[PDB]
């Protein structure tokens, strides 16, 4: 009888439910069917309501009564979600008890304006020496992880999460960083294995995993990045620092293409809807560093875009690259060359990371990147331009040692005090004597002995983090003592 | 007729409003759906579907909208506060401040949509603008009171190039300025807003000089498509009513065309090539023609243009070429080498490359530079296969000169202090004319090619040569 | 007298590479015209 807060279903098909009634329903309002399946009403038409399903269409028949929820799609937030595996809606799926909720934040929240923002200066050490030295990331920055299939995009994001363990032991809040991993379109076994990998390093108890596997309905895969961002936006608004990794956005646009094409919304380029750019624009823009009057918190977003044959000119990636504050291109061709991570430095770049990079590294990394900027040009032509000229051949025996030094095994984040000695031995070229077969093992115990030799040389960086001219006189005294090993 | 109308349907960012007969609002009007507080929802009338039904485009988010709510008709397009009181304020497309520094002081109000100046009132201005960059004020000089475009894809140095032109011109230029941001990053506006408070252009103690109207990429496509028409209204008021020479930096104008494609699909339009809207040249032409220098005042515009996937054949930038007086194409291959600015020294053209504007001297200097760089690019295969030894004695010298030139084209920008650590260097216009001739003649054919990287002027190349030799 | 044998075979192996890269270009153009028109036909005949 009443069709203002309830309504009967006209037709349900492939997750799309057209319901008659709901005269007082809002746009993007969560609804509840008579079979426990949720859903939100995207397009409010004249005489009917287009509702997508957060589940299966098997339990819904024609004429099913549809109760409302009277609220836009919101999700639980707070610190009581740290260490829990949840879906896109917020319901726990790890089985470790229900979710204690502090407050709730909408899934579709407008990004903060200009004035509540401030210039980024807080660093975010990923642990990778090839990243923090060449493409530094600040807190509130948008650094894209774009690459082809199985080139190391996921493993780079994990190394950033595992690296932030050494700051969750202390009490300093400016260095704290809580991680968020939003699995979009993956399989149940991969995400579950990723949880145990994060539980194998005590990295789960400060990170929140939002699982939207491939079996779930397309509205769930679409909403998972937005809900994950809102769950990390709670830390931003309360002064704390947060980090979220979208893995990935290339499969989210596929799910958003289903909701659009099945709600009879007109398609655009490459069968994707028109606002496929606005799908990602309002998502990454919600990550920034805010004023001290607004809390002083920061949320950093790491999106992942899987290309097809290195095609950086495809529809979806060209949009994302135009949004982020830089990208980290992973070329599958450099992976077999030995370079791991296969970071094509000639294309990856950060923008406002130069002033966010550590001062102890900027003192040695500012010139370091430009040594490879020359090396990629000369090393590519030593048999094509077949002229045996030893005039500028010194750059070849210099870059091949540092580019081989940028290697780093999987899930092995090197600390700031563990990376600065290696770079100084590379920029100066004082390790060119050792062959290309023992340099990878030279680094293995060049870091370990420095702890036993001078444990008071790492406690200063743990408090200050800056190396002055005094240590420059000591580094020269440390260098010459271990050149014969 | 200001009254009420009811919502019939809400689909994404497209909301249709049902009106009563003889109360139908005209097209390009402003409809207000009342939310209790400020920053209430505004709608832009796009089509007359018939049966007293109007299809509008949202200027904000449509979440929370309920079918049947009343919709007010202001009987006029989106009218923004215009005047000298807009300087130093951060305003959205609706005409409301978002810097929470209070209301906007103004008297006369003007709509965002207006007919462009007729052919009888057009003004022909062939005036050179002294920028401060060597490659700019040589090969492709900018035209004061004209329309300048910056191209290239994502990561070639378009926004940094603008932040450099602000530092150089906004204080050398006497008239006011309007910086409208169309669908760009929000932090880049904040990183620019702080520099406004420190450059002296914007101050909170005294009345500022520039107006900031920003419509970021987080705002729905209805806002990005009309925010360029908002900042344009402020510039035209300084041209028609104040009669001042105004700077109109647009970044980025590609989002205006892109936002029109995200709405055209939902408005039931047959998609054109590359998923673009049928009203491609007209919608751009209805904005590029209003940005022109009339006989009352003058408006200079430096519009950065994003190039999708580095594809200059894309319909969006290709239509922009016909509107610009001077183009500055940024090639990605130049950025990969480490040369900034990545201005393509052959594709960057200008209308003021004539002997009637700068003289026969400047026109002949820039002519030999391009011929040299074209002859150097013609020998790209030989150098990589036959080496330097297998060349004639004439083009050998040109190769030795072109390498010095294209490395001397690079200039450390004042904003590029954080990217290179090198202090910014600024040169004049006529200093570059004699500096290149001393390179083309052979007077300075003894200095190394690495002494031209990141230096400004020819008298500084020698200063670096003495230190590097020792 | 052996440079030519390394420059004559470099001409018959380049021509054998031009043909295979001229047919592929005609294939890719033929794929662009369709996969873009189909993208228009889908969007146009959606109404």
């Amino acid at each position: 009888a009443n069709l203002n807060e309830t309504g009967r279903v006209l037709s349900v098909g492939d997750g799309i439910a057209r319901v008659f009634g709901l005269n007082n329903i809002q746009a993007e309002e969560l609804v509840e069917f008579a079979s426990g399946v949720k859903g939100m009403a995207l397009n409010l038409e004249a005489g009917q309501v287009g509702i997508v399903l957060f589940g299966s269409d098997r339990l819904v028949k024609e004429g099913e009564t549809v109760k409302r929820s009277g609220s836009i799609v919101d999700v639980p937030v707070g610190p009581a979600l740290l260490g829990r595996v949840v879906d896109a809606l917020g319901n726990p799926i790890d089985g470790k008890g229900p979710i204690e909720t502090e407050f709730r934040i909408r899934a579709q929240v407008k990004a903060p304006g200009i004035l509540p923002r401030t210039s980024v200066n807080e660093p975010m050490q990923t642990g990778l020496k090839a990243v923090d030295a060449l493409v530094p990331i600040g807190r509130g920055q948008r650094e894209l992880i774009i690459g082809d299939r199985q080139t190391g995009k996921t493993q780079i994001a994990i190394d950033t999460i595992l690296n932030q363990k050494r700051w969750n032991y202390g009490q300093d809040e400016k260095k704290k960083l809580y991680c968020v991993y939003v699995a979009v379109g993956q399989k149940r076994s991969t995400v579950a294995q990723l949880v145990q990998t994060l539980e194998h390093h005590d990295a789960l108890k400060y990170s929140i995993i939002v699982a939207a596997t491939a079996s779930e309905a397309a509205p769930l895969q679409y909403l998972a990045p937005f809900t994950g961002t809102a769950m990390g936006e709670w830390f931003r608004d309360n002064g704390k620092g947060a980090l979220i990794v979208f893995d990935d956005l290339s499969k989210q646009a596929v799910a958003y293409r289903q909701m659009s094409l099945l709600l009879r919304r007109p398609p655009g380029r490459e069968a994707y809807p028109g606002d496929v750019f606005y799908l990602h624009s309002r998502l990454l823009e919600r990550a920034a560093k805010m004023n001290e009057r607004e809390g002083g918190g920061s949320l950093t977003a790491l999106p992942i875009i899987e290309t097809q044959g290195g095609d950086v000119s495809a529809y979806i990636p060209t949009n994302v690259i135009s949004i982020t504050d830089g990208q980290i291109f992973l070329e599958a061709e450099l992976f077999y060359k030995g370079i791991r991570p296969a970071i094509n430095v000639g294309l990856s770049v950060s923008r406002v990371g130069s002033a966010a990079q550590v001062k102890a590294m900027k003192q040695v990394a500012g010139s370091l990147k430009l040594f490879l900027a020359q090396y990629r040009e000369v090393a590519a032509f030593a048999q094509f331009g077949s002229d045996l000229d030893a005039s500028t051949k010194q750059t070849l025996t210099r870059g091949e040692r540092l580019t081989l030094l940028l290697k780093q095994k999987q899930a092995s984040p090197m600390s700031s005090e563990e990376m600065v000695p290696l770079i100084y031995a590379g920029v100066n070229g004082y390790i060119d004597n050792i062959p290309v077969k023992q340099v990878e093992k030279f680094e293995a115990e060049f870091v370990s002995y420095l702890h036993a030799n001078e444990s008071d040389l790492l406690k200063d960086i743990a408090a200050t983090g800056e190396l002055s001219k005094e240590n420059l006189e000591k580094l020269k005294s440390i260098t010459e003592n271990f050149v014969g090993s | 007729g200001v009254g009420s109308g009811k919502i019939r349907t809400v689909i994404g960012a497209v909301v249709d409003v049902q009106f009563e007969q003889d109360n139908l609002p005209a097209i390009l009007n402003a409809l207000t759906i009342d939310r209790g507080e400020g920053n209430k929802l505004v709608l832009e009338v796009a089509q007359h579907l018939g049966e007293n039904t109007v299809r509008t485009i949202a200027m904000d988010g449509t979440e929370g909208l309920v079918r049947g709510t009343s919709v007010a008709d202001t009987g006029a397009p989106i009218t923004i506060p215009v005047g000298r009181g807009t300087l130093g304020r951060i305003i959205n497309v609706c005409g409301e401040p978002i810097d929470e520094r209070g209301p906007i002081e103004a008297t006369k109000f003007l709509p965002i949509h207006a007919d462009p100046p007729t052919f009888a009132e057009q003004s022909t201005t062939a005036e050179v603008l002294e920028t401060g960059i060597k490659v700019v004020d040589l090969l492709a000089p900018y035209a004061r009171g004209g329309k300048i475009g910056l191209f290239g894809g994502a990561g070639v140095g378009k926004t940094v190039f603008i932040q450099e032109l602000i530092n150089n011109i906004a204080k050398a230029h006497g008239g006011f300025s309007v910086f409208c941001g169309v669908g760009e990053r929000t932090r880049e506006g904040n990183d620019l807003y702080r520099e406004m408070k420190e450059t002296g252009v914007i101050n909170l103690e005294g009345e500022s000089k520039v107006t900031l109207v920003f419509g970021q990429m987080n705002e729905p496509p209805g806002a990005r498509a009309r925010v360029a028409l908002t900042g344009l209204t402020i510039a035209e008021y300084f041209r028609d009513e104040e009669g001042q020479d105004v700077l109109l930096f647009v970044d980025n104008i590609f989002r205006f065309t892109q936002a029109g494609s995200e709405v055209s699909a939902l408005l039931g339009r047959i998609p054109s090539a590359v998923g673009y809207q049928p009203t491609l040249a007209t919608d751009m032409g209805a904005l590029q023609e209003r940005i022109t220098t009339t006989q009352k005042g003058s408006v200079t515009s430096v519009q950065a243009v994003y190039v999708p996937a580095d594809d200059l054949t894309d319909p969006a930038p290709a239509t922009t070429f016909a509107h610009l007086d001077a183009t500055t194409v940024l090639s990605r291959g130049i950025s990969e080498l480490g040369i900034y600015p990545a201005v393509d020294p052959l594709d960057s053209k200008s209308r003021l490359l004539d002997i009637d504007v700068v003289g026969q001297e400047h026109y002949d200097v820039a002519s030999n530079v391009q011929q040299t760089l074209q002859a150097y690019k013609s020998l790209q295969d030989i150098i990589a296969i036959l080496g330097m030894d297998e060349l004639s004695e004439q083009d050998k010298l040109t190769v030795e000169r072109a390498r010095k030139i294209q490395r001397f084209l690079s200039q450390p920008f004042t904003v590029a202090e954080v990217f290179t650590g090198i202090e910014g260097r600024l040169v004049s216009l006529k200093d570059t004319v004699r500096s290149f001739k001393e390179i083309l003649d052979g007077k300075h054919d003894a200095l190394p090619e690495a002494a031209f990287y990141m230096v400004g002027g020819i008298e500084e190349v020698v200063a670096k040569a003495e230190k590097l030799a020792a | 007298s052996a440079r030519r044998n390394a420059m004559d075979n470099a001409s018959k192996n380049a021509s054998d590479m031009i043909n295979k890269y001229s047919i592929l270009y005609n294939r890719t153009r033929q794929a662009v015209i369709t996969n873009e028109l189909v993208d228009i036909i889908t969007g146009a005949s959606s109404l």
Binding site: - | - | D8, A10, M17, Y21
Partner: peptide, 27 residues
């Protein structure tokens, strides 16, 4: 891809310009 085909054509088509003009020069 499509963008690089014509780019890779102009290289190979102009490599033919070099090798064919080094067979008679050696004669």
């Amino acid at each position: 891809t499509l963008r690089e085909i014509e780019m890779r054509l102009k290289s190979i088509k102009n490599i033919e310009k070099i090798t064919n003009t080094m067979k008679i020069v050696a004669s």
